[model samples]
Every structure is written in C-alpha cells, then in structure tokens.
Target chain A: TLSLTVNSGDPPLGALLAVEHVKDDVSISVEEGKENILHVSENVIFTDVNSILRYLARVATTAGLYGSNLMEHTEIDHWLEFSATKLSSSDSFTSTINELNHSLSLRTYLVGNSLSLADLSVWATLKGNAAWQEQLKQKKAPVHVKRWFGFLEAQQAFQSVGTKWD
Target chain B: HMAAAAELSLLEKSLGLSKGNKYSAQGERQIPVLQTNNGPSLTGLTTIAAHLVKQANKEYLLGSTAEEKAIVQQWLEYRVTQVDSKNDIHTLLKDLNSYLEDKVYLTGYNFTLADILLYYGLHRFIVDLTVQEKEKYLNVSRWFCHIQHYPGIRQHLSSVVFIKN
Candidate 1:
C-alpha cells in the first residue's frame, strides 16, 4: 500500500488517479505543505506528481491503466509527456486545443480503447487551466475536445477531487 | 528515419538474428515500428527503444532497479515533451546541460535507453543550430558528441541528417 500527502485547495490529481485506477493499491491523507507530494511506503518519497503517477502505474501494470502492449505503452508515455509539456503551455493553447479536438473527434479516449494514464494526465492539465475553463464556458473550444473533456470531467476521480474551473 | 533503420539493423546484428527484425519500408514511414516474431508490432521512438531494451534484457540499457527505471522513464518523457516550445526547449536543454555537467549519462553512471531517447530527440534539433547557438549548450554538445563516438551509436548517428530550424 502507498500513502500519499496532498494539500487542501490544490488536490493531487496524480494521486487521485492512482487511487481510481489502482483501486485499493493506494491510500491518501491531507497534509499542509508548500505543495503536494507522495510518500511511497516508508523509505521512498517523490515530490513530483508525474513521478508518483508513473510509479503507481508501474506498480499496477495489470490494471491496463498504463498499457496492454509495447505500442500502447509508448503511446501512453507520449501522451503523458504531451500533457506535462505541450498541454501546459499557454502559448500553444489555441493550437493544442484545436489539435486535441481534432484528435479526440473520433476517439473516446486518448489511448487504446479504455481510459489510461494519458487521459488522466491530459485531463488534469487541461481541466486545471483557468483559460481552458473559460474556453469551455464560452464555447470557444472545439466540440470534440469539449466532449472528451466533459467525459473525463465526469469521472469519479474528478468528482472526488471536486474538479472545477477557477 | 535512416537512424532508426540503422539502429534496428545494428540491434539485429547484435542479437545474432539472421532474417527477422530487419527494417522493411512501407513508403515514407513517419515513425519506427518494431514487429516481434509473434506478429505484434510497436511504434514510436521511445517505445521502440523500450521494446529493444526489454528484448535485449540487458541491465545497463533500460535500467536494472525500479528507481533507476523510474528515472529513465522520467527523463524519457521529459525529452519527448520538452521540445514543443522553443522556450521550453532552451529551458530543458539548459537543465539537461546542468545535469550532465558532472555525470557521464542521463540515468545513473552508464548509457541507458533514456540517453538514447534524449540523444535522438535532441539530435533532430541540434543539427539546425548555428555554431554560436551550439556553443550555448557546451555541456550538452559535449555529451552529445561524446555519445556519437560509441561504436554502436556512431554509425547510425552519422547517417541521419535531422535538419530543422
């Protein structure tokens, strides 16, 4: 079992993802700190959310939340990097939104047939952006991106963490 | 494209495979695909690298321990993502330059899959840089040039011209 430490206002979406995907593999607790962190077991610690998420996914590879095959695994990794870097850039926001909308137009999820780390990471990045929220509210986003975003937004992980646009 | 094919060819030679694992072009392939003997195919640079690492089953390449693997994975993703924006590129390169200051490799003390992924990703952009632009990342350039001398990586590294601005 893993113990995670997170802040109040700023929820650890990565940890929430581990909890959702890994089921009983993890446990969460609130802690006051400068930022969210994950403490694995007792000896290991990760201050980076992505590291924690990757670790959990590695630990629970059978969940298929990571990938079922080598190609799928790479796709998941690509999308995770896409989330951390491309998705987070405000400069590429409009273009990325357009691209995502186009890509998600025909697909239900970012990778494979089911939800994986890719969807979770991308959803967390996009949903947390206030500008993205405004884009959704003002109907500025593409229909496909909005649809996929809404689909992930409705997941239990987002619901548990009270995912919202600020 | 040539580099990938070359790497796969080298991997085939190293693994002592005769007919299998050869690169077959289907015309203007945008990505590398590794087809297993059982008919499962995988694509993408990092994925192909990871697949090869596992297939090689070597401890020094991908990583031996979970912690080392995690770091390799982390840097692998970073190299893939950090090139999107020029600003991010500079930032990531600077960070990498700093990190490579005292270390010989990206993960631990030896060459790993992480290094290969970063090397290929950065090589695509490094070719377009002016001499002065290249000078800015002295450590990165040094490490990159150092890796190019390796017997396994040298031939493939020199074969590809990843020209980009």
Candidate 2:
C-alpha cells in the first residue's frame, strides 16, 4: 500500500483537493483494478477569500478551462455547481445514505462497481459535517453506505490511523 | 410587481436560491427508484462536483493532469480548511465583504468561474451574517444585483426564497 501523510485540520475536502496538486506529497494507491485509497496528512492553512478564489480557479483551470474542448468550461462549471448546490443540501446526504443502504443491503460498495475514489472523497465530506456543523453524526448510511464504510473500516488502508469508527 | 419583488426578497434567507433547483435535480439523478438501486445517488454540490471531475472523458475542474491536479488538490484543501459556526443562521456568509471588494463581481471584472462557487456561498453570507454586517458590505449589494441580472438565475430565486426557514 502506498502511504502519505497530510497536515490535519480542514472543513472537509482539504486533503482530497490537495492530493491533486502535489503528487506523492499526497498519494493514492490503487490495487490494480481495485479501489483507490489515499494517504493524506492532516495539516491545513487557511487563507483569505480572494486568495482562495484565485487559487481554486487556477487549480480548476489546470484540469482544463472554459476554452478547452476536452470538456467545456461549462462542464467544470456544472459539477462545481452540483457540489456547492445539490451536494450541500441535506437531501443530498440523506439520499446518499439512503441509496448506499439500499445497495449495500445486498452487498458492499458505494457506487455499483467497487470501492472507488468516489467512496473516499464522499466519506471525507461526510466527516466534515461534524466539524463544519453540517451534520452531527454518521446517522445511517444506506445499507451500501454502511456496508461500504464498514468495509473501509475493516481495511488496513483505511485503518492506518485507528479504527475507532466515526 | 415591485411589492411582489419586495416580498420575494424579504422571504429570502439563503444566498443559494439562484439557478433554482432544476439543474441540481437533473445532475444528481440516479436511475430507477430507491428500491432498485442499493447505492445512494449523488449529493452535496461541491463534493459531488469533485466526484464528477473524475467521470469526465476529458479533464476535470479540480484536476486532470498530474501536475494540474496537484494545484486543485492544494486549493480544495485550502477551501475546506475554513469553516465557520454551524448554526443554520451562521451557515453561509462568512466571506462576504472581501469577496466582493474592489471589482464589480466577487472575483474578477465580470462574472467568471469564481462567481459560480461564490454565488452559492455568498448568498449564504448575505442572508446569514448579522444585519449590520450585511449593510456594512456595500459590494455585496451591487454584486447580488448583478448576479440577479442573469435571467437564468433570477427565475428560480423568487420561488425558493419564499420557503426560507
């Protein structure tokens, strides 16, 4: 398993976003076709709004920008819109847990395929709810959310810190 | 009409009413009903968007290339590190004034990429921050109006604000 440590403390998505910036500074080890697991440090430094905006925009652009054809700027704009809007809505979390429960009720995994970056990244934000005052507890993830999170807890990759089970 | 507009504005409590909920529903749509699928569907605007970036055939907004993704990761880390009091009233508007300083829009000259994130985030700022703070931030007034100027956004603004808690 590939391991990396990040400086702790953030609202959420701090390390997940940082991993994309400096590789190895943050590392994700995928076992062949298996799920992607990230090792992140926990440190963070908060900056001003303008600086945050400029930096986010630049990072967003690095993936591709409005002018590029790979995926229009509108595409990036669309997902960003999705994350800020629908994702934050309580319904979004409720639904994710609902769906995961339904899916995992049968078996494990968040999305149908396997343990994915989606699972890890989404889990990161879910944990943030506590710190950000977004949500208080794990509540009940869908059977899938529960099973998947449960599976994650069992894994050595996820348990690197300690398996207290938030 | 002015009275209606006034009413609409009054009912508003959050800054994210713009663009309405139409697009949000469509983007996160999961096939079939809850019964058929076991896994939960998409949720959370920014987090989901982060997930979507991976799905795109091309580069994602947060990062696509190794070098490029590095920065997106760094910035997202920076973005999420900052959180304010979680009280519903205190939920949204932490970065109001400075976000709208100097220029017309929250970011650069016109509505650029930053506005997309700032719009949702700022609406929370304007509505949640104390009334005194709201008045103190002059640029927010101008910026809010400019954002409303967008026909696509304004249509949904009125209705959603009506339900504010």
Candidate 3:
C-alpha cells in the first residue's frame, strides 16, 4: 500500500508529475500534503524527491519508470543525482541545462528507450525553475532542451501540474 | 596520486577488473568523467564508480533489491553532497557515529559502493584523527577500520591506527 503527500513547490513537483503515471498501475493514492512525502508503509517512508520518485517508479513497479536492468538503473540514478545536486544547485541553468540538452539530442529518453524517472526528474526540475522558464518565454531556450521540454510538457502527465514555479 | 579520477581507477582494480576506459576531469571541481570510444560519456565520482562495479559483473555492490538500492543511492549522493562538502568534521563524524551503530556497512549487511567510496572520501581526515577523536566518532572508527583493512581497498593511502580498547 502506498500513500503520498505532495505539493506544487519544492520537490513535490517531480513526485507529483511521476505519480500521475503510476496511479492506475499501483493501488496508491495521492493527497495535497504540505510537503513531498511518501509513506510506503508504517516503517518505510521517504522525505526526499529522488527517493520518493524511485519508490513510485521502481518499487511500486508501475509503468517501469525506474529502468529495466543494472546498467539503466545506474544511468537513471546518475541523472536523478545530477538533477538534485547540479540542476538544483545553480542560480543559472546555462551549463547544466545545455549539457542535458546535448545528452538528450540523440535519445528520446534520458536512460533507455522509454519514459523513466530520469526524464520525469529532469523535466520537473526544468519546469519548476524560473530562470529556465524565463528563457522559454524569451525564446532563448536551447534547441534540444526546448524540443524535449515541449514534448514532455504537452504530455498528459506534465499538464496537470499547472504552472507553479520554484 | 589519484584524486576522484585516480580514486575511480583504484576502485576499478579493487573490483578485480582490468583497466577500462580513459577518464577526463570535467569542470573546476574536476569531477571524473569517463569517455567511451563508442558510447556517451559518464560523469561524477559515484556515477562512474557505480558503472565500474556493474561492468565488473559485481552488481551486488550496488544492492540487490529496491529498498537496498534506495539506501545505496542516498548514501552515494550523501557522499558527494554532504560528505564531500563537509567538516565541522565535528558534526559530520558525530552523525556518522550514531548512524553506524550495529551497522556493518553503509547498506547494513551488504557491502556496497557506498562503503568503499565513503572510506576513501574520509581517509585524510581519519588519518588526522587523535585517539580521543577516534573514540569520539567510535562507530565511524569501527566502520573505517573494517574498510581500510579490506584487501586492495587502501591503495595509494597509508593506514590509520585504531586503538582496540
């Protein structure tokens, strides 16, 4: 049994975006809590964005959002860490976002052939940022980033999160 | 000799694999980035270290289950984000001491990349510790003692003595 409390700000953004995809697959319910929290059980709960997303996508086993095997798992984890540490660290997103844009140029997904937590994690981080979105509004966003961000933005999962920026 | 990149190569050898791809230092912090002849480059210390463990076919080092995987992932990130960026060595070691109580490794019973990387990450400070400080972070001392004596783990680093009493 899984129950999550999520908000629009902070990291609930990614958990919120990801939980939409997993709602039907697992029997979990989500609520508008004050912070991003996942109560996996009485004993297992997660307070961090990356771990919460990992639980929904991987442990919940819904839609295979984490990855398929060891290699992909590591890759996905790498991106999740990158998002949490690097993407969130910067006041400006130039280098990190551009590096991500180039990485996504040849691949639709960040890790494998399909939508995984890596895509959702990075996407949510980009969506929640004021600086990055200002670039979008100013028509100055990088080519591949705009392409990938727009594709995911148009998707059903991303649309529901609305426009609450961090 | 080895910073993060060299430390990674040592980790690769400790995992019992032969030499793998070459690495280039990326950015001012110079995080290690591994470039393959055919594949996209991999970056960061823990990221590349996890890659090498899997390449060696010793996947258990990353953890065998989802719960353990999350535990390992948090520790790996904690290493870079918290552990690497630390010290009031005071507060950091204090927390680690409490956390390691009865825990054989960072991932509990299973030894994962978390233990190996963290051991190397803390080596310099641990070497500088006085006996009172060792006992202060006694659990850290316990855990570090176990990791340091592991075969091939202490490469390019001198040993730190821990009092048995």
What lDDT tens digits, residue by residue, belong to model 1 across residues B1-165?
235565556554343334446554344544566665645777655666666655666646767778888988888778556642454567777787678654556774556767766766676667666767555765576557646544455444443221111
DockQ of each: 0.01, 0.01, 0.01
lDDT of 2 by residue, A1-166 (tens): 2333333332234233333332333234312222222322324323332222223334444432122443333433443443344445556566544543443332223322233333444455544454223332544233334434445545544554333223
Worst 10 residues of 3 chain A by lDDT: A104-113
DockQ of the two-chain complex in candidate 2: 0.01
Across B1-165, the per-residue lDDT of candidate 2 in tens digits comes to 122122222212122232212122332222111111225664433444343333333233444347555544543433334421344432233344454443443323333323434444345445544545544544454456455544344444432121100
lDDT of 1 by residue, A29-141 (tens): 44555667767766778877678778878877667688778888888888878778877767778786777765663355676356788888888888777788788668666
| Full candidate order by TM-score, most accurate first | 3, 1, 2
- Looking at model 1, residue A50 earns an lDDT score of 78
Question: B1 in model 3: Cα distance from truth in Å?
Answer: 9.7
- TM-scores of the first chain across all predictions? 0.85, 0.40, 0.88
In model 3, where do residues sit more than 4 Å from their true spots? A1-166, B85-87
Worst window of 10 by summed lDDT in candidate 1 chain B: B156-165
Interface root-mean-square deviation (Å) of every model: 19.1, 20.7, 22.1
Clashes of 2: 48
Write out fnat for all predictions, comma-separated: 0.00, 0.00, 0.00
